[PDB]
Ligand binder design. Structure first.
Ligand SMILES: *[C@](O)(C(N)=O)[C@H](C[C@@H]1CCNC1=O)NC(=O)[C@@H]1[C@@H]2[C@H](CN1C(=O)[C@@H](NC(=O)NC(C)(C)C)C(C)(C)C)C2(C)C
Ligand SMILES: *[C@](O)(C(N)=O)[C@H](C[C@@H]1CCNC1=O)NC(=O)[C@@H]1[C@@H]2[C@H](CN1C(=O)[C@@H](NC(=O)NC(C)(C)C)C(C)(C)C)C2(C)C
Lengths: 300, 300
């Protein structure tokens, strides 16, 4: 037992991190087969199409540890640069590029100068920011999930917003949210709490012996959502309820009953108590995160 | 910016995890050079010396993925079993075995059937338990730190206490705390909060723009420790103050002034507010964790 904010093992991704230097900019790239993916802002209101037509392959210095990689072609796809290199990464895992939905969680392998610094778990917020931990040099660090043996890359880091939160793209270079890779006025947008994730985490708490927040009451989806809005929670849909089905089945607590418990927590606060060692309602565990950590699924 | 509970990249350790099966018990082992380390309770008020004299090398089935490892010798060192195998692990990193002090943090690579499931950050509690996330089959999972290129193994998982917390050994098989690998009555002991870590995390908060908890006041080490005891905090020593020196220097906040701020937080609570996204005072970041995450140190 126990419940921790758990990241995927990062080895498959560590084997793909490289350093990309162009002019005065150094950042990280993702080396998969014979392509290195990095943020297009590594090139020297900028017009990146113009900037890129003016660069040569030899302007890109790609370093994989102490082995320099020669670029033999380059292209831009949305806000990512794809550097064709003459060597396929022998450590390339099985992988997919996925564009995730807000509320979905992923692991971030924070990197500097192509070298992994740390791994941690994030959620894509409803306002399409992530609350990451990123210092200068971390651009090109990627977020990912692992499904059995396959790495699903879902995030590459590009920039920090003035509120200290972070914005980036999928691995095809499309930003999450309305952000652009320009030094222009941009604000994150009002965030909301991921309701289906809070409920999942309450089920995690029950599976682990926390029960103090339960009540004998129930609610309709409609009356719950009426309370959710006042507290800046995302609407809970029937699809969310369906997703919460297995956790409901394992614990014997109807989804709508756990909603009634969340309602009472929202209205009365936690009154000096903790749930899974938190004094806040935690929303960066999906239902599938809870099932993975509470049943013991492995990867390889 | 941002501050996250960050684990070390786990790739160097993933390359060392194996499955050890003996009789009806399957658990994880750590394969370094030609030795596999696992908990001595994998062997069939038990007297392990007797139990082990009665086992043969061929009773130990060691699986490294889809390659079976043949045991050519075995010995017991305290509560760990060392299985000599005929093949040195080619993925063996630079490594050390270290016995950590309470208050020190480490990353845990949770494993089942030799296969990594997830990575998360832990502290050794003052009562020598860890608040981990461990299901049946996770024994032999290890905790570790990485210093540049070297993996310092500090923990191997053995058992769960009735309060849902966890106990284990160093990699030489000595338990942390008074625990024994017997199914006998054992209780964790009253825990306390790691004071020097809370102060480090408050400095992390300042480095990241949280300042609301600061005050114009100061305190002596003696008067602070008087308040610390009432709230079940570990005594803060001058050595702790010295360790907090760099963070004090970077932020311009004397250690004793940050103590006065912690005093006021202990006495008034946080009153509806959060620090680094927590509504509790967080104590599983060491001073060195804060400096690593707020300056960008990498590993390789
Ligand atoms: C990245 O390029 C790298 N080399 O690591 C860097 C990562 C940043 C640095 C601090 N924390 C991070 O996550 N990204 C950038 O420097 C991007 C890059 C240029 C500006 N930029 C920023 O993140 C800036 N933010 C910013 O300008 N925000 C606005 C005003 C657009 C809302 C800044 C000030 C450097 C943090 C581009 C092309 C956006
Ligand atoms: C480990 O052997 C494995 N195969 O993974 C297992 C890990 C446990 C299982 C559930 N969560 C864990 O961390 N460890 C054990 O089974 C150890 C082993 C035998 C009992 N044991 C326990 O952890 C038990 N706890 C326990 O007996 N606690 C006392 C009463 C001593 C305080 C239990 C009940 C299985 C959780 C030994 C030799 C201690």
């Amino acid at each position: 037992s126990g419940f921790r904010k758990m990241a995927f093992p990062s080895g498959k991704v560590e084997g793909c991190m490289v350093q990309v230097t162009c002019g005065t900019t150094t950042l990280n790239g993702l080396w998969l087969d014979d392509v290195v993916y990095c943020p297009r802002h590594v090139i020297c209101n900028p017009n990146y199409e113009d900037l890129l037509i003016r660069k040569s392959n030899h302007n890109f210095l790609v370093q994989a540890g102490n082995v320099q990689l020669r670029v033999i072609g380059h292209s831009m796809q949305n806000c990512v640069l794809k550097l064709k290199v003459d060597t396929a990464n022998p450590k390339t895992p099985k992988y997919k590029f996925v564009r995730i939905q807000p509320g979905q969680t992923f692991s971030v392998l924070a990197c500097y100068n192509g070298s992994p610094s740390g791994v941690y778990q994030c959620a894509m917020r409803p306002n399409f920011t992530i609350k990451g931990s990123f210092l200068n040099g971390s651009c090109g660090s990627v977020g990912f999930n692992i499904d059995y043996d396959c790495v699903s890359f879902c995030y590459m880091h590009h920039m920090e917003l003035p509120t200290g939160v972070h914005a980036g793209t999928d691995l095809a270079g499309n930003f999450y949210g309305p952000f652009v890779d320009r030094q222009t006025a941009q604000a994150a947008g009002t965030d909301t709490t991921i309701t289906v994730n809070v409920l999942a985490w309450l089920y995690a708490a029950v599976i682990n012996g926390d029960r103090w927040f339960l009540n004998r009451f129930t609610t309709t989806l409609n009356d719950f959502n009426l309370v959710a809005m006042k507290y800046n929670y995302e609407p809970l849909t029937q699809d969310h309820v369906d997703i919460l089905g297995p956790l409901s089945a394992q614990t014997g607590i109807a989804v709508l009953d756990m909603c009634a418990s969340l309602k009472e927590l929202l209205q009365n606060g936690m009154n000096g108590r903790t749930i899974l060692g938190s004094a806040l309602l935690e929303d960066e565990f999906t239902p599938f995160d809870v099932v993975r950590q509470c049943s013991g699924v492995t990867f390889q």
